[PDB]
Design a protein around this ligand. Structure first.
Ligand code: CL
Length: 545
C-alpha cells in the first residue's frame, strides 16, 4: 500500500514514504514546503515511465495512476519546467534563485546549452564566488579549485591549457568579484546566461506541410522555428501575444493566431507523445507570460516584501566549507520533512478524532431530546389525569403531584447534560478547524500553479491578455550591449583564450555563434527581426521553408 519515493532537487535528496493514493500535488507540496519554496509555478517533478520516457507528474492525478517506473524508491527529479523572462526582475526567494542557478549551470557544464569559451570562463568565476565566497590568498592555496567542476568538456578539449592554467585564469576573474554576496554571484551568473541563444528553449523535431525538417522552439517569450542545421539562430518567431488557441490531432498540431486574417500555423510531430509535451509547455509558458504583463498579486507582493526582509536578516546573522554547508542544508531539509510528516499525522489524527466525537455527540444530543420529549409527554399526560381525578381522592392527588415534579427534576438533569454536550460539540469544531487549517498549511495555494492539460487529440483556447499589452522584446537589450564592464571582460577573455585555441576543434555551434557575433546579431535583435511582418506573412514563410 504505502510507497517509498525519492525526490532529487539540485541541492538535496529527500527520501520519504507516501500513502497509496497520494496525488501528484501532495507529493509536490511535501517537496516544496520542506525546502521552503513558494514560487511553485516554475517547477515540476520529472520521472521515467514504464516505456522509458521522461515525463512530468500531473498534480491532480494519483501518483500510482501515472505509471512511474516501478522501483524502490520511486525516482523523481524536482526541476524548473518554466524559466522566467527576466531573472533579475522575477526570482524572489533565495531558494528559487539557487535551484535555477544550479539547474542552468548544470546545462552549461553538461553542454545541454551552447555557451562559448569566453562566457564559460566568466561564468565559472561567478560560480566559484557563489560556492566559496571571496577569494583569499591567505586561506585559498593553489589548487584550491581542484575538486570544482569548472568548464564544459567542449571548452577544455579545444584549448591547449593545463588544468593548473585554467584554475589560475578563473582565479584572476574570481578576484574581480571581491565583496559580492553569494546570492548576487548566483544572480549575476543567470543574468549573463539568460542572453545565451539556446537558454530556456525547449526544442522539438517538426515538419511543415511541405515536409521540410525543422525545429520548433518553445520558450518564455514565444514560439520559434529553426532549420535543422542551426539551433542557435531562429529564422521565424511568434510572440505569445499573437497566439489564440492551440490543439493537436494525433501527429498534426494546429496553432490558431489572434489575427483572423492570418491562416492556421500547422506542423507535424513525429509522435503524439511529442505533441502533448509541446501543448503543456505552450499552455504553461503562455499563462506565465500573461502574469508578467499584469501587476503583482497580493501573495507575490508579500513574497517580495518577505524576501527583501529575510535578505537583510541573513546579512546581520553573517565560516564553513562548501561540502559541509551542503551536508547541513541536506540535514535541515530532512529534519523539516520529518517534523512536517509527524505534524501532518497528528493533525490527521486530531481531525478524525474530532469528527467521530462530533458524530457521537450529535447522536447523544438526539437521545437527550428524545428522553426529554418523553418526559414532557408524561408531564402533559400526568397533568391531564391529575386535573380529571381532582374534579372527581386527596391522597392520589398528592401522589400524582409528587411524580410530576420528580419528572421535572429529570428534565432539569438532562437539560444540564445537554448544556454540557453543546459546549463539547463546539469545542470539537474548534479542534476540527485547527486540524484542517494545519493540514492546509502543508498545501500550496492551487491558483499559484500553472493550469495543466486534462485527458488522440487535446487542446483549446489560451486566455487572452490585457488590452494595453506591450511585448517586452521590443525594448530588450543583452546585458553585454548595456554593460560596458561586461562587454570589456568578454573582450579580454576572447583575446586570452585565442592564444591557446586549437582551430581544428571548433564545433559546428562555435562557427554559427562567431558568425552571429560577426554579423552583429544577438538573441533579442534576432527575435525582433524574425517577428517582423504580420502573422500571415510569417505563417507563409514557415510553409515555404
Ligand atoms: Cl488553495
Amino acid at each position: 500500500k504505502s510507497m517509498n519515493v525519492r525526490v532529487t532537487t539540485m541541492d538535496a535528496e529527500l527520501e520519504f514514504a507516501i500513502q497509496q493514493t497520494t496525488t501528484g500535488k501532495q507529493l509536490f507540496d511535501q517537496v516544496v514546503k520542506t525546502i521552503g519554496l513558494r514560487e511553485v509555478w516554475f517547477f515540476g517533478l520529472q520521472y521515467t515511465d514504464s516505456k522509458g520516457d521522461l515525463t512530468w507528474i500531473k498534480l491532480y492525478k494519483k501518483v500510482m495512476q501515472q505509471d512511474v517506473k516501478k522501483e524502490n524508491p520511486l525516482q523523481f527529479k524536482f526541476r524548473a519546467k518554466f524559466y522566467p523572462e527576466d531573472v533579475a526582475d522575477e526570482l524572489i526567494q533565495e531558494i528559487t534563485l539557487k535551484l535555477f542557478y544550479l539547474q542552468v549551470k548544470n546545462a552549461i557544464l553538461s553542454d545541454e546549452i551552447y555557451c562559448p569559451p569566453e562566457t564559460s570562463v566568466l561564468l565559472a568565476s561567478y560560480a566559484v564566488q557563489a560556492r566559496h565566497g571571496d577569494h583569499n590568498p591567505a586561506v585559498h592555496g593553489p589548487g584550491f579549485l581542484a575538486n570544482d567542476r569548472l568548464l564544459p568538456q567542449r571548452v577544455t578539449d579545444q584549448h591547449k591549457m593545463s588544468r593548473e592554467e585554467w584554475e589560475q585564469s578563473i582565479t584572476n576573474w574570481w578576484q574581480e568579484h571581491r565583496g559580492m554576496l553569494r546570492e548576487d554571484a548566483m544572480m549575476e551568473y543567470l543574468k549573463i546566461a539568460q542572453d545565451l541563444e539556446m537558454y530556456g528553449v525547449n526544442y522539438f523535431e517538426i515538419r511543415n506541410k511541405k515536409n521540410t525538417e525543422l525545429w520548433l522552439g518553445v520558450d518564455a517569450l514565444g514560439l520559434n522555428i529553426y532549420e535543422k542545421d542551426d539551433k542557435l539562430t531562429p529564422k521565424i518567431g511568434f510572440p505569445w501575444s499573437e497566439i489564440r488557441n492551440i490543439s493537436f490531432n494525433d501527429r498534426k498540431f494546429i496553432i490558431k493566431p489572434i489575427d483572423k486574417k492570418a491562416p492556421d500555423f500547422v506542423f507535424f510531430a513525429p509522435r503524439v507523445r511529442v505533441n502533448k509535451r509541446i501543448l503543456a509547455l505552450c499552455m504553461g509558458n503562455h499563462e506565465l507570460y500573461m502574469r508578467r504583463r499584469k501587476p503583482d498579486t497580493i501573495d507575490v507582493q508579500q513574497m517580495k516584501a518577505q524576501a527583501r526582509e529575510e535578505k537583510l536578516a541573513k546579512q546581520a546573522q553573517r565560516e564553513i566549507a562548501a561540502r559541509e554547508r551542503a551536508e547541513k542544508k541536506q540535514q535541515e531539509y530532512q529534519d523539516r520533512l520529518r517534523q512536517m510528516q509527524e505534524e501532518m499525522e497528528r493533525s490527521q489524527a486530531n481531525l478524525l478524532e474530532a469528527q467521530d466525537m462530533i458524530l457521537r455527540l450529535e447522536e447523544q444530543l438526539r437521545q437527550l431530546q428524545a428522553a426529554k420529549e418523553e418526559l414532557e409527554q408524561r408531564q402533559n399526560e400526568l397533568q391531564a389525569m391529575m386535573q380529571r381525578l381532582e374534579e372527581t381522592l386527596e391522597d392520589e392527588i398528592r401522589a400524582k403531584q409528587e411524580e410530576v415534579s420528580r419528572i421535572q427534576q429529570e428534565v432539569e438533569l438532562k437539560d444540564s447534560e445537554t448544556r454540557r454536550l453543546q459546549e463539547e460539540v463546539e469545542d470539537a469544531r474548534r479542534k476540527q478547524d485547527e486540524a484542517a487549517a494545519a493540514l492546509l498549511a502543508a498545501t500550496t495555494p492551487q491558483h499559484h500553479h500553472v493550469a495543466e492539460r486534462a485527458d488522440e487529440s487535446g487542446g483549446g483556447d489560451l486566455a487572452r491578455g490585457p488590452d494595453d499589452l506591450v511585448d517586452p522584446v521590443a525594448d530588450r537589450r543583452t546585458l553585454a550591449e548595456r554593460n560596458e564592464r561586461l562587454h570589456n571582460q568578454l573582450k579580454a577573455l576572447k583575446q586570452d583564450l585565442a592564444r591557446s585555441c586549437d582551430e581544428t576543434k571548433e564545433t559546428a555551434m562555435d562557427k554559427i555563434h562567431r558568425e552571429n557575433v560577426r554579423q552583429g546579431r544577438d538573441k533579442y535583435k534576432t527575435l525582433r527581426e524574425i517577428r517582423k511582418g504580420n502573422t500571415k506573412r510569417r505563417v507563409d514563410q514557415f510553409e515555404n521553408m
